[PDB]
Paper text:
For gas stream cooling, we employed a vial mounting procedure to transfer the crystal directly to the cold gas stream rather than moving through the low-humidity ambient air. For the nine crystal/cryoprotectant combinations tested here, gas stream cooling at 100 K using the vial mounting approach yielded lower mosaicity than normal plunge cooling into liquid nitro­gen at 77 K. For the subset of crystals tested, the anomalous signal from gas stream cooling was comparable to or stronger than that from plunge cooling. Gas stream cooling yielded a stronger anomalous signal and SAD structures could be determined more efficiently (i.e. with lower redundancy data) than with plunge cooling. The differences between the refined protein structures are subtle. Both structures have the same 33 residues built with alternative side chain conformations, whose occupancies are highly correlated, with the largest occupancy difference being 0.1. These three residues are modeled with multiple conformations, including a peptide flip of Lys182 away from the RT configuration, which is modeled with occupancies of 0.33 and 0.26 in the plunge cooled and gas stream cooled cases, respectively. There is thus very little evidence in this particular case that faster cooling via plunging into liquid nitro­gen changes conformational ensembles present at LT compared with gas stream cooling.
Here we investigate different cooling methods for several different protein crystals. We find that as long as ice formation is prevented and care is taken to limit damaging dehydration effects, gas stream cooling yields lower mosaicity than more rapid cooling methods (plunge cooling and hyperquenching). To assess the impact of the cooling method at the individual protein level, structures were determined of normal plunge cooled and gas stream cooled tetragonal thermolysin.
Author numbering: 1 to 316
The structure:
């Protein structure tokens, strides 16, 4: 919509106050003109028609319970945009400043959130398995990272390539969570999963086995469920990424940690320059080693740590 750029205030799903960029034309709309070709947040009104109505508010104050999923979808899309632009010099998910559109209140009791190829879609959850999923910055950034993947390597969503696709989204979802630096961790979805249970998550990057996911190539799932285990076998790569950043000794292999910024630079370069739609785990290792070589030199600690981490998870 055409209007004045304004700054509203509201509270997100977890009750935290934040400012949001809006546009004023009779109503205040969740339209942020400060980032690329805009960030736009819509109300699906418990239906499945997309995108729905551009979110309109009478007073630029978003403190109602019904407002909270929209506040977070809008604000965390902005954080994700800022991460990719400021850290990787990438303008929106496509690198060409595409508008970021999100719809909240999708369907009823819907325990999922997804990038659908052109926008983000957030269920409100059923209140037991999930609360509204835009409350999780890692979920928001995980799904927007699928769009980055689609516009770069094009990893296919099955078998090893699909597990890499998933892990890439968990890695950058977590790096966005740290970039905000409010309540970061190496878990996925902890803010919105199981409101009645503290200390759990959908999966752990630091210890995938906590939730029964593999932490070594020898433990990879080879069945047909979950598109060949894409959210399961992601644990193998997630563990490697955790080790690259934080270090540790895993199955007797010591890894010298190089920190989060270098992890992100290495994997971003791998994704955008070297991976292809059918890259397997071994090819990801090669891409990460080559990326670290490009950035830091073949004799660098960074290259050595990449190799150690993939060794530790059994990926040669
Ligand atoms: O679905 C509708 C959308 O197309 C637009 O017109 O904004 C209002 C919504 O009701
Ligand atoms: O144009 C392409 C679009 O159709 C989709 O495939 O996502 C990646 C883009 O390069
Ligand atoms: O395109 C944007 C317009 O929609 C808004 O009204 O003001 C800022 C512009 O950049
Ligand atoms: O506690 C939260 C509240 O602060 C917000 O306004 O609406 C959603 C709730 O989860
Ligand atoms: O979605 C609608 C939008 O298209 C229009 O510009 O302003 C009102 C909204 O309901
Ligand atoms: O609208 C109120 C808001 O002004 C305040 O900041 O937090 C409580 C809300 O109910
Ligand atoms: O063969 C693997 C071994 O090399 C490693 O140390 O731990 C897991 C085993 O499956
Ligand atoms: O069965 C597949 C297995 O062969 C591969 O190694 O990892 C992904 C699985 O889907
Ligand atoms: O992946 C690279 C590709 O993007 C470039 O266009 O040609 C050389 C390749 O290494
Ligand atoms: O061609 C190589 C590719 O297969 C690997 O995955 O990434 C690095 C490239 O050198
Ligand atoms: O070759 C390396 C280069 O690619 C990078 O600039 O880091 C230092 C050099 O060792
Ligand atoms: Ca209001
Ligand atoms: Ca997290
Ligand atoms: Ca929980
Ligand atoms: Zn998803
Ligand atoms: Zn995913
Ligand atoms: Zn967290
Ligand atoms: Zn799955
Ligand atoms: Zn998923
Ligand atoms: Zn271990
Ligand atoms: Zn460990």
């Amino acid at each position: 919509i055409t209007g004045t750029s304004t700054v509203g205030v509201g509270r997100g799903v977890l009750g935290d106050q934040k400012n949001i960029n809006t546009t004023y034309s009779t109503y205040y709309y969740l339209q942020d003109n400060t980032r690329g070709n805009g960030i736009f947040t819509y109300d699906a009104k418990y239906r499945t028609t997309l995108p729905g109505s551009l979110w309109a508010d009478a007073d630029n104050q978003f403190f109602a319970s019904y407002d909270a999923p929209a506040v977070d979808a809008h604000y965390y899309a902005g954080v994700t945009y800022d991460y990719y632009k400021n850290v990787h010099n990438r303008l929106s998910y496509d690198g060409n400043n595409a508008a970021i559109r999100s719809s909240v209140h999708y369907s009823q009791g819907y325990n999922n959130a997804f990038w659908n190829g052109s926008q983000m879609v957030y269920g409100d959850g059923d209140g037991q398995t999930f609360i509204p999923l835009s409350g999780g910055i890692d979920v928001v950034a995980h799904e927007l990272t699928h769009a980055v993947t689609d516009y770069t390597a094009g990893l296919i969503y099955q078998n090893e390539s699909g597990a890499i696709n998933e892990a890439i989204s968990d890695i950058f979802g977590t790096l966005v969570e740290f970039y905000a630096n409010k309540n970061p961790d190496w878990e996925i979805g902890e803010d919105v999963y199981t409101p009645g249970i503290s200390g759990d998550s959908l999966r752990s990057m630091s210890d995938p086995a906590k939730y029964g996911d593999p932490d070594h190539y020898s433990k990879r799932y080879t069945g047909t469920q979950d598109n060949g285990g894409v959210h399961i076998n992601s644990g193998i790569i997630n563990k490697a990424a955790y080790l690259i950043s934080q270090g540790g000794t895993h199955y007797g292999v010591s890894v010298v940690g190089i920190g989060r910024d270098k992890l992100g630079k290495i994997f971003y370069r791998a994704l955008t320059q070297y991976l292809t739609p059918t890259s397997n785990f071994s090819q990801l290792r090669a891409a990460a080693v080559q990326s670290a070589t490009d950035l830091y030199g073949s004799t660098s600690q960074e290259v050595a740590s990449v190799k150690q981490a993939f060794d530790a998870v059994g990926v040669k």
